[PDB]
Amino acid sequence: SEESQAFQRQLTALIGYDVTDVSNVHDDELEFTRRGLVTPRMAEVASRDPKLYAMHPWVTSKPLPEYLWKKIANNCIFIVIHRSTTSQTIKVSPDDTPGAILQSFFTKMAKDFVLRVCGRDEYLVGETPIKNFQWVRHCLKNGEEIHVVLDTPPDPALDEVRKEEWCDRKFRVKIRGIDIPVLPRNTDLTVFVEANIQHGQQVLCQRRTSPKPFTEEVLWNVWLEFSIKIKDLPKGALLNLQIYCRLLYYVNLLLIDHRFLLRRGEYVLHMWQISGFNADKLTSATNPDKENSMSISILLDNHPIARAEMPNQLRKQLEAIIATDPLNPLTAEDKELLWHFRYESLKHPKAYPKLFSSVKWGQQEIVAKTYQLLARREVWDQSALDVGLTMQLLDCNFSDENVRAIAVQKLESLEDDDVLHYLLQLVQAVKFEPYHDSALARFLLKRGLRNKRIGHFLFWFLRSEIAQSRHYQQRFAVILEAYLRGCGTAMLHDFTQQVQVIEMLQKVTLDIKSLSAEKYDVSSQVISQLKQKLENLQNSQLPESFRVPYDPGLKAGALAIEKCKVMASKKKPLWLEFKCADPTALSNETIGIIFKHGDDLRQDMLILQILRIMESIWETESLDLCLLPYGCISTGDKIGMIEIVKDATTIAKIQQSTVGNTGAFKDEVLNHWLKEKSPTEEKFQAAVERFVYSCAGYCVATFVLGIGDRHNDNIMITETGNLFHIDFGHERVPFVLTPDFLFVMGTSGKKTSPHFQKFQDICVKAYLALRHHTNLLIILFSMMLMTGMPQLTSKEDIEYIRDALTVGKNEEDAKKYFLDQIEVCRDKGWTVQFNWFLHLVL
């Protein structure tokens, strides 16, 4: 058809990659997966409720934390309804449904409709108590009043989805040879090929070639015989082919394909080059740069596939192995114990990761028995979702389809609320699937299509990776295409505007980093063309309005060209401010966006999301630490959108206003600065308060993730007392608790204080609360390192967090350890901060 072509061309542009193009393939797994995804997509599209889909109530089943109940001192919540220029305030109880509210307002004044929040595409509707809406919980936490407009439900027809048209030999590979157009480097060290049979980052078996000269063309013409039988290869096994002299080049080929056939025949595989363990090392994708890249050539000639009583001290040993954290290596002795007593091990949902990584995947009969084992899934199926546990089964240690589906099965009882929390890490976990079609991919697809807020973020998380990693762009592009094919015409339109806006702003942030070298002075000569360039696009190019990618409820309109600037940084970010598109917005404030180029913007995403998780983990134990994890979305290569928090300034800038000299710091400017911004001694008091919580929150959070040692430049504070770290994109100090912080805390040097006793109190409460979730945190950390960073040590980088969380200690030792950290920051005072300036001559 012809309109099926126009729309494909559309999808391509939304995606930033062409899923039909086939220059860089060697089997049809990608196409097959496009076909396979049609079914679950269509099922979820037919299944979802029109009305609730269009309105996407954002809701939770969690209780209201004690610290938000305190703010309804009366069992009544105030809601303010609007006509056009008229308004009225209604008393309501926290167990009231928005249904029970519209009628008690219609009975109120009486001389069909829905309540949507003023200034936003957000809605209070569906059978949920209003205490349970996220907007309502945000308004309470922030002391703001609930503003809502009476209007019509959005026509569900706007989400119209378009109709779619659619034996016993040992294993052996021959290494023919290697080639690369341009070699010239060091000189001539030897070079060899190493072949691994791999399953779940476990090497089943390994053969090398002879060493030989590193010329632009090397040849071996050898059969490498492996020790494994063909019949013993498990589904998901990779042939991992590596070049040394030392690891220089890698590529992978799936030994068994998406059709359960053994891979046979000739290959010429274009390899990836090491930079100078991580998720990139595992990809089945070949390098698409056919011209510059090293290739290897190989031939595959080789086809069907498809209890009693435990003694006492053994149980103790078993149970002691199970109580161990996810990063304690299992001894051979440990593995046999788990395996031989597998059935006793199946009663402990917690044993599952260690049990399934006690399996000899390279023996067919053992795999069989493992599959018979997972048929008895009573205990697993009946245990409560432990997200931590489930993530472990989706990391690089598990390549078995059946082990990974019981993890995914567990994810099914996450409510949208929790999915949104884990959504980025689940997307990144797609990098550990052996095949493009997975239970995990389909979970994401389904949940994305069932809820617009999940859909939206799923679009950007996938597009973020599609634009910046060649290693996985093909896989993620197929998943996104599948998504965009069922999300609906209103969302496609919405997406199209967002992509147009960031693309236009790219041709801008583009030509501007250029105009002043690295000299930090920003000429008005340079803000000349910025303003000119913005005016340009405003007429007949730049969309009327766009959904703010990191805050999808909010609609940005026209630039406020006057307030736009180029920021002072060595990078040259755009400081952009937009008008709100929504005439019902209560405020007149601008939407400020930093548009930033030339940095790993994905690590900032990873870190910020872990922060949000940490807040929720704190929520489950009734704590509020007033983090401010600002919005931040990667749109493409080295480059994206970042939310500007209002009335906020850098600590550094605060230190450079009164005086600003060369490495000099003052203890009282911050405190004084808070007073000058506080119009009442009251509001001043509320500030010192927020500072104590926010300061402690960042100290703990940041200690734990090992990102605590920051320069002043990258710590901010709001006029209203909220501290917050920025720019996580990659003597020492565990965190930033400097004398200027301590002076706000009404303390100095040796002595104590009321606010400082509190600050220590809150740190300890918060720390030991994360230690209750030790395992979840280690798995997120570990996963972040593998799918997020440069190079990292499978036992060194990752183990930082175990020591940071002080694994294996009683609550008392741990409190001590953390309180010692506070003392370390005290001793060093201004030292490290000063060092930065010192070194700018080293």
Ligand SMILES: COc1ccc2c(nc(NC(=O)c3cccnc3)[n+]3cc[nH]c23)c1OC
């Ligand atoms: C007045 O200058 C700023 C005001 C608010 C800012 C702000 N910067 C923010 N973030 C950043 O500048 C930033 C840079 C690179 C990577 N991530 C975050 N940031 C995140 C939330 N709010 C803000 C301001 O510039 C220093």
